[PDB]
């Protein structure tokens, strides 16, 4: 909906958040297995 330029920015920002969460998830696995 709304302006495509606005909606695309919000979607990009949220998808970047997904990438950061997934990357932090694997780093947490490595930290836990190191313990």
């Amino acid at each position: 909906g709304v302006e495509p330029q606005k909606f695309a920015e919000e979607l990009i920002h949220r998808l970047e958040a997904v990438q950061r969460t997934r990357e932090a998830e694997e780093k947490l696995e490595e930290r836990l297995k190191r313990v």
Binding site: G1, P4, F7, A8, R14, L15, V18, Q19
Partner: protein, 359 residues
């Protein structure tokens, strides 16, 4: 609306109503034993008992508004299909407040929904047996093939809108309150359909979408039946698209173009998809997963049509002449296709109608 008390002391409601189908000639309709069966922001659903026949009916009471823009009565008068709930009568009534006008849809009563039965199995930490998943999905795709042949798109396909008789395994699509006859070149509102079941091109704001948004919704329903919960549980409209992308991966530029060409130039982050075999439980039947992968496509024209879906190999067991319900009784009507129903792909009848049912 007059009221009387019969023997057994029940409250009897008598109205003048118009038949849902056939000639426009009003008739007295009397019912009793009314109780609230469902709810909405703009109305109430009741169960009642017709006085002459004793049959249970449902009465959907919907508040009328000038800006409401509800095509529900007009669509329901036109529909006649074994997998769609039949309109027996309709009449208008007034509420307790001034200028409070209600449309009353007297429908055939069906005791359960796919949502309630699925939730019941889910709460018992169990999955619905696959034969019922085939039966429910097949009848849904059958009803979508019917309405789509008129250009009519339901736009709110979800488990709550799938009526269900558990004794017979008959499914009946209901709740045409969002339904519209889509006309090519005439735009349609993109904020439509319940969030968990909303096609991605709608979330992208496409107004030129087609009846394939229902096939995406059916895919969500099938996935939910296999999973035990909704597959795409978005917290909001944009989050719903994020939940979709978390499973299917980021749509390609060509898929974005097919959903909404205004977004083809944007470089979105590439989210790695979950493999289809990891989305569901290990013992989920592989044909159910395969069929689901052909419904939950980004590109709307790549989704199976409802007639093609009915012909998918996941439903082969339904076409077996030995197939019967687990309780013992035989399956409901499955192969009595009409010319209207088959109009999208008339040659497919040789696959949809097996020789034993041609007889």
């Amino acid at each position: 609306m007059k009221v009387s008390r019969d023997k057994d002391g029940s409250k009897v409601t008598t109205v003048v109503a118009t038949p849902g189908q056939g000639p426009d000639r009003p008739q007295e309709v009397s019912y009793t034993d009314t109780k609230v069966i469902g709810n909405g922001s703009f109305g109430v659903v009741y169960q009642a008992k017709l006085c002459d026949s004793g049959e249970l009916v449902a009465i959907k009471k919907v508040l009328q508004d000038k800006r409401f823009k509800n095509r529900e009565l007009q669509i329901m008068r036109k529909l006649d299909h074994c997998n769609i709930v039949r309109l027996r009568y309709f009449f208008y009534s007034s509420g307790e407040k001034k200028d409070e006008v209600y449309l009353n849809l007297v429908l055939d009563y069906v005791p359960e929904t796919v949502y309630r039965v699925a939730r019941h199995y889910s709460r018992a930490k169990q999955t619905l047996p696959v034969i019922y998943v085939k039966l429910y999905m097949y009848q849904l795709f059958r009803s979508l093939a019917y309405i789509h042949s008129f250009g009519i798109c339901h736009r709110d396909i979800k488990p709550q809108n799938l009526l269900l008789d558990p004794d017979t395994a008959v499914l009946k699509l209901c709740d045409f309150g969002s339904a519209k006859q889509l006309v090519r070149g005439e735009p349609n509102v993109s904020y439509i359909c319940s969030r968990y079941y909303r096609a991605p091109e709608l979330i992208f704001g496409a107004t030129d979408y087609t009846s394939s948004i229902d096939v995406w919704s059916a895919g969500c329903v099938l996935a939910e039946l296999l999973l035990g919960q909704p597959i795409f549980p978005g917290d909001s409209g944009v989050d719903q698209l994020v939940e979709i992308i978390k499973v299917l991966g980021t749509p390609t530029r060509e898929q974005i173009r097919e959903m909404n060409p205004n977004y083809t130039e944007f470089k979105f982050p590439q989210i790695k998809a979950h493999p289809w075999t990891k989305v569901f439980r290990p013992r989920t039947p592989p044909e159910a997963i395969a069929l689901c992968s052909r419904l939950l496509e980004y590109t709307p024209t790549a989704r199976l049509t409802p007639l093609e879906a009915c012909a998918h190999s996941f439903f082969d067991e339904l076409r077996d002449p030995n197939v019967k319900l687990p309780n013992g009784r035989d399956t409901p009507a499955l192969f009595n296709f009409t010319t209207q129903e088959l109009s999208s792909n008339p040659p497919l009848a040789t696959i949809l109608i097996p020789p034993h049912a041609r007889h």
